Amino acid sequence: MFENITAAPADPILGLADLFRADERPGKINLGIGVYKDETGKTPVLTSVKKAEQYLLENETTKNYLGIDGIPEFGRCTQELLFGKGSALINDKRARTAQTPGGTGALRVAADFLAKNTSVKRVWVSNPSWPNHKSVFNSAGLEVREYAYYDAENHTLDFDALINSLNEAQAGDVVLFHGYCHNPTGIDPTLEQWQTLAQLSVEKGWLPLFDFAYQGFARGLEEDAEGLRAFAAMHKELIVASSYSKNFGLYNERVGACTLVAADSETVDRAFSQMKAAIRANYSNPPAHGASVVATILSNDALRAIWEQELTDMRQRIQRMRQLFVNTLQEKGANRDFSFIIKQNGMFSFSGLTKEQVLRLREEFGVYAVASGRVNVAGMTPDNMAPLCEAIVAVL
């Protein structure tokens, strides 16, 4: 049965981690996967999560199965994080959320749901976008179409091109928007652009699907939710696939949510019963650990205060590294102006390096970036800034 199975091509983001491991050189630098690193190049588990874990260890009475949709409090906390505390979606009971294995699991659950319960056949994703989007939607049977986004010459958001590209999108098409900290560009729409987009989609009949994986990494929790709320305020339907992997440093615990909003309570509930059937036929019910950690921290005032500060530290440290990167590039002889980097949000800098420059950096210098030129600024520390910038200016 398996004789003719061909080998899958390595994952552009995840297979990079394997190469780096297989690397015997001393000063290799990993600017690949989107995992936060502190000043010492470690990825510690947050103090707020260690505390919640101790609490879980003291207080859990059972490992009995959660419901298909997970921990209710987890869902309630997600809705408030996404939509706002006194939100109308919340008060009108227009939203239902299922806890899922990470944001990827939420995107998948959304895909399967749409594929088996609606008339959707096409999903629009930006160019460029997180490389695994195409793959998740293609797995559910939907096709992926691309809309213009980034202007590589000017390193800006080419809004008119975005708009004109999206004009090929039909009524009933799913259009995927990133929350904030666009992966991989770091280029995001202004709020005005978000309102323009919100009125346009309501008018063209698109179903918005938001991939929200970096809430809190640009300006703050409530601020990063602006585009999505602008949308929620005028759409009767939408789905949001959120992740707590990056903002809680809970990467391997697989914590995410897929929230579904419809016109009213009765409709969203009927629609949710199908989402649940889709979950049951996939992984059955979600893993409790990471999500009860998130529910515990979010529900406890002291624990939340500590987490928000840890998230504030992550954000500010990345901001400090961006600056250090553009300055050091200048001091090291990079004769190109990399200052556009100062203008991007999140962990990623779309460097504008060619696929061959990216190949040379890793092959001659052990510096690891995604072939697209995406670099992890959060993976940069003041100790590796110099050798890294020397490697870069040498392939330029």
Added chain:
Amino acid sequence: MFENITAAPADPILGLADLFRADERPGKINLGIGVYKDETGKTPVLTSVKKAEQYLLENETTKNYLGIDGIPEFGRCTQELLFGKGSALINDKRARTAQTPGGTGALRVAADFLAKNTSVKRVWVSNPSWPNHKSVFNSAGLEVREYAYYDAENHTLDFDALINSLNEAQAGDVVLFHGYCHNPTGIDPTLEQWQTLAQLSVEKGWLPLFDFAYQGFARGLEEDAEGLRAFAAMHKELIVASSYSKNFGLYNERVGACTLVAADSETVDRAFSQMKAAIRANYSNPPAHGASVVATILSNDALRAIWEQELTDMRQRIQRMRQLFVNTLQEKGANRDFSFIIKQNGMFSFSGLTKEQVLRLREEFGVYAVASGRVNVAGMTPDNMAPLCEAIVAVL
């Protein structure tokens, strides 16, 4: 988009838990979902797992992403549990395992893999079988066909009917076998019958897929793996979807494995790269908590000794409850011979109650069983044995 979505029919096993919760009556008894209960009707987290969790809390340095396939040691321990310590599959590097979100997640991963990488279109499942099998395979696009299994009059395994049914199965078809403690009947093949089945499938060209969710609940760990090893010994290819939800009381942590075996190392590896691509497009990488708990317990001699005894206690207590059930049924006036119940393995007794008897028990007596007549003997305690048996003899 969601206006015409119909409500999904409630899950036969999982929606039962909701009804039971919505129930305001005092003495309701839940004999529904396959979750173990101790003499007091609680589902404690095992002492061996609480200890491993403390260790994890003390020793974890990061929550950084696991590989798509998980914790390597988890995979190694699974292979030894399934195939044996000095196994040829292990020594020849013929097997590859991916850690998955539960056994369901493993069945799904297997389905997606087979659907997108082989020429499989049909999966054969027993009649009856775990209700969610059809649903997982149908989700991947495969069709489910049924093979004869249980003789309801004699409450035995109708082996000739099994064999003759399976004759409609073509070369290249997937045939799903349960490890041991067949869900829902508790009726399993003798080892001789397992060897007969192993030679037959090798001859007819079937690809065996084992759902192993109760290893250790019939006779013991190594003993319950007999049928599967009988098969492994003569098949060049097979996939096993195992679960640690029941044998480690780790239900909500979602701990399972999908192991893939091919003719040689090169083939299984090439085949595994596609399994990994399938995982990446679903939930990305698996949740660490439950699996590192399992790896820790399995790798530590003291911790393993304690777990094996806890599993021995679970098994023996269920055995004591079966007996108590048939005796009390006799003492309570159940004029039907329920002694076949003594002959079943695992947590489930296929009672032979009609769908209406099952409806009356829950509606008039608050006793909850699956509509199929499947009862959870592990959910029985000496405190609820009497009112439960009185309810049953009253609907007979």
